[PDB]
From a paper:
LC-MS analysis revealed that this proteolytic product encompasses the entire ExsA-NTD (amino acids 2–178). Two molecules with very similar overall structures form the asymmetric unit of the crystal. In chain A both termini encompassing residues 2 to 10 and 166–178, respectively produced no interpretable electron density. Despite low sequence similarity the overall fold of ExsA-NTD closely resembles those of the regulatory domains of AraC and ToxT. Overall, the fold of this domain is characterized by the formation of a beta barrel structure, which, in case of AraC and ToxT, houses the ligand binding pocket. The beta structure is flanked by two parallel carboxy-terminal helices α-2 and α-3. However, a dimer consistent with the experimental findings may be obtained from the ExsA-NTD crystal structure by generating crystallographic symmetry mates for the two independent molecules. In the A/A’ dimer helices α-2 and α-3 form the core of the interface, whereas no contacts are observed between residues from helix α-2 in the B/B” dimer. Our structural data suggest that L140, K141, E143, and L148, previously identified as critical for ExsA function, are all directly involved in ExsA dimerization. Yet, the ligand binding pocket used by AraC and ToxT appears to play no role in ExsD binding.
The operons encoding genes of structural components of the secretion machinery and associated virulence factors are all under the control of the AraC-type transcriptional activator protein, ExsA. ExsA belongs to a unique subfamily of AraC-proteins that is regulated through protein-protein contacts rather than small molecule ligands. The ExsA protein consists of a ~100 amino acid carboxy-terminal domain (ExsA-CTD) and a ~170 amino acid amino-terminal domain (ExsA-NTD). The ExsA-NTD mediates homo-dimerization but is also target for ExsD binding.
Numbering used by the authors:
A (entry chain A), B (entry chain A): 11 to 165
C-alpha cells in the first residue's frame, strides 16, 4: 500500500496519479512539476499532490522516496472520523493548486521520521493508517489547510 | 487532559487512580508500586497502570513525568474503532497484573518522543488522541497485549 521507492531518473519521466497522494523525499533529490509550477524539495520535505499528471525527475541521483496514495475511500473514512474539527477550517481558495507544499515544521518533521521508522521496524499495519491521519491532520491545521479542505469536498 | 508533571518526592506518596492510565518518565526517576510488585523505570520508559491504588516516589529528585489518563469512554471509542484487529490478540491471562511494563522498543521510543514534542510545539488537540491510539495499538501488538485486552473486556 505505502511504498519505499528507489528511483534513478537523469532526465525526467511522467506520472499519472488517479488518486490524491503524498510524495516525501527520504534520500536524494526529487522534482515534481505540474502545468502551473515546479517544486524542488530537500529531504525530508514532502508534497501533497492532487489527482493529475506530473513531470518527475531525480536528476540522475540515487533516490529513495516514499509514495503515499490517498484513496477516496480512506479520504472519506478520514473526513468522517474528523469532519467536526475540520469544519473549523476556512473555506477555499477555489483554484486549489494541485501540488501543495508545506512549510518545514518540527511536528511535520516528526511525522516524517515516524514513516521512515515504520519501514525499518516491524509493526501493526494500522500504525501506518494512524501516521497518515496525523499527517493529514497537520495539513488541515496548517495555513494550507483550506486548500486541502477544498480538495476534500470535491471528491 | 494530558499533563506534564513536575514532581519532587523524597520518600513516597499515594495515588488512587479511578481510571486506567499511562505513566511515562520524561526526566528524573519514578517508582510505581502496587500490592504485588514494584517498577523502577528509566527515562523515557513507561508503564500502563490499571484502576487502583499505588505508591509513587521520585527519590527526592526533580522529575518531569507525563500522566496520560485513559477514560472508559475513550477506551470504548478506541476498541470500537479497532475491535476487529484486536480480535487477533490472544485471550488472557486472567490475573492481569495491574501495572504493565513494556520492553523498550524503537517504535515505543518514537511514540514517546512524539508526546514530548507535543508538549513543546503548537498542534491540534486531536494529534494527542492519535498519539495515544498509536501507543495503545503498540501495546496490543506487544507480547503483553493480551493483558491489555483482558483489562479491556472487563470495563
Amino acid at each position: 500500500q505505502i511504498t519505499s521507492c528507489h528511483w534513478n531518473i537523469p532526465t525526467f519521466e511522467y506520472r499519472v496519479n488517479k488518486e490524491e497522494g503524498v510524495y516525501v523525499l527520504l534520500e536524494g533529490e526529487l522534482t515534481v512539476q505540474d502545468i502551473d509550477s515546479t517544486f524542488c524539495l530537500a529531504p525530508g520535505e514532502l508534497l501533497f499532490v492532487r489527482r493529475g499528471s506530473y513531470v518527475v525527475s531525480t536528476k540522475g541521483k540515487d533516490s529513495r522516496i516514499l509514495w503515499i496514495p490517498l484513496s477516496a475511500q480512506f479520504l472519506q473514512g478520514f473526513v468522517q472520523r474528523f469532519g467536526a474539527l475540520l469544519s473549523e477550517v476556512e473555506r477555499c481558495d477555489e483554484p486549489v493548486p494541485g501540488i501543495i507544499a508545506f512549510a518545514a515544521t518540527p511536528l511535520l518533521a516528526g511525522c516524517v521520521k515516524g514513516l521512515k521508522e515504520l519501514l525499518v521496524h516491524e509493526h501493526p499495519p494500522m500504525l501506518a493508517c494512524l501516521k497518515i491521519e496525523e499527517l493529514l491532520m497537520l495539513f488541515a491545521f496548517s495555513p494550507q489547510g483550506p486548500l486541502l479542505m477544498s480538495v476534500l469536498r470535491q471528491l
